[PDB]
Paper text:
Recent structural data revealed the existence of an allosteric pocket in SARM1 armadillo-repeat (ARM) domain which is important for the regulation of SARM1 activity. NMN binds to this pocket, leading to SARM1 activation.
The bound VMN molecule sits in the central groove of dSARM1ARM, which is mainly lined by the H3 helices from ARM1-5. The interaction is mediated by two pi-stacking interactions between the indole of W385 and the pyridine moiety of VMN, and between the imidazole ring of H392 and the nitrobenzene moiety of VMN; and eight hydrogen bonds, with a buried surface area of ~910 Å2. The hydroxyl group from the side chain of Y396 and the amino groups from the side chains of the conserved R437 and K476 form hydrogen bonds with the phosphate group of VMN; the amino group from the side chain of N640 forms a hydrogen bond with the nitro group of VMN; and the imidazole rings of H392 and H473 form hydrogen bonds with the urea and ribose of VMN, respectively. Comparison of the two structures reveals that the NMN moiety of VMN and NMN share the same binding mode, with the key residues involved in NMN binding interacting with the analogous portions of the VMN molecule. Furthermore, the pi-stacking interaction between H392 and the nitrobenzene of VMN is specific to this compound.
Residue numbers in the entry: 373 to 675
């Protein structure tokens, strides 16, 4: 009864504050009951492919990503690429969503997804005008930047990912712009990419953005990120709090300020201690940079 399960999970994620726990508990139930394995078996049957992919896309949570990686990554990447090739916009959104989440597991899994065509599929879809698809693409590239590690940055350089990112950063949609800028803020730690970023001028988009958006309202602006990111994702963003580039530090501080507000309402403020962001934030709350300092201080107060 996929149509009914997909509706339940969609409604669960959408509950403000509680949707994080509700979606996680349902998606974990799917794994423990054997339903996740059934979806992976069915996603290679042409008749059951899109319905299976539609539910997979909504349940690629932390532990389920591990399960897919261990049991059938090649099948899931294939279905996602099939979906991006389909003409229906509903399909394109699903395929790009799957790939966005498969880039949030590990360096090695990013390498496998790239090997199987996942990055090529995302870059191809960057040509679309569909906002939801483009939002998935920008998020996928931010995730790949955060999780790919050094090996995969060389592969991003060869495929000219920075080039695909800069147009997304100048997009007028705030969610596309934000996640494109987050990817860029992460990648400037790579000195070869840094040169291209400085020439682009995209980093100049940060100061107008963070001073014009209230972190709390921005969180509520898109259902997909209303509950924030996982501690494993935030752990990987912590180093940007001490980036070489002032603009990147500013964006990371804004992000942590937003996450602090969200995690306060969930009772998960302890994750910041676990990922050693408290000390990284305390340092920024004392530095001369007034923009980043204010955001980090508000984050600590929210924590
Ligand atoms: O609330 C969340 N996500 C919320 C959300 C919303 C709508 C859909 N989905 C689906 O879930 C899978 C991605 O999972 P995520 O990478 O976790 O987003 C994908 O299939 C996605 O379509 C998730 N995450 C979270 C938060 C706090 C902590 N924490 O406090 O440690 C840990 C994790
Ligand atoms: Na919310
Ligand atoms: Na914008």
């Amino acid at each position: 009864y996929l149509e009914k399960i997909n509706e339940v999970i969609r409604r669960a994620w959408a509950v403000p504050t509680h949707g994080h726990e509700l979606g996680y508990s349902l998606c974990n139930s799917l794994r423990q009951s054997g339903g996740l394995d059934l979806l992976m078996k069915n996603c290679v049957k042409p008749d059951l492919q899109f319905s299976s992919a539609q539910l997979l896309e909504q349940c690629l949570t932390t532990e389920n990503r591990k399960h897919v990686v261990d049991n059938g990554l090649d099948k899931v990447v294939n279905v996602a690429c099939v979906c991006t090739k389909n003409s229906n916009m509903e399909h394109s959104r699903v395929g790009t969503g799957i790939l966005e989440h498969l880039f949030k597991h590990s360096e090695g899994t990013c390498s496998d997804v790239i090997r199987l065509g996942g990055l090529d599929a995302v870059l191809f879809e960057c040509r679309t005008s569909d906002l939801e698809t483009l939002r998935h693409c920008a998020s996928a590239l931010a995730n790949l930047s955060l999780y790919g590690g050094a090996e995969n940055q060389e592969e991003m350089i060869l495929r000219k990912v920075p080039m695909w990112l800069f147009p997304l950063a100048f997009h007028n949609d705030d969610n596309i712009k934000y996640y494109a800028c987050l990817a860029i803020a992460v990648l400037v730690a790579n000195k070869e990419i840094e040169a291209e970023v400085l020439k682009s001028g995209c980093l100049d988009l940060v100061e107008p953005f963070v001073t014009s958006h209230d972190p709390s309202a921005f969180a509520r602006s898109n259902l997909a990120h209303a509950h924030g990111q996982s501690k494993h994702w935030l752990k990987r963003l912590v180093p940007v709090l001490s980036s070489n580039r002032e603009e990147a530090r500013n964006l990371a501080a804004f992000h942590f300020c937003m996450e602090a507000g969200i995690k306060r309402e969930q009772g998960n403020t302890d994750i910041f201690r676990e990922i050693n962001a408290i000390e990284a934030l305390k340092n920024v709350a004392s530095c001369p940079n007034a923009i980043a300092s204010k955001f980090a201080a508000q984050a600590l107060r929210l924590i």
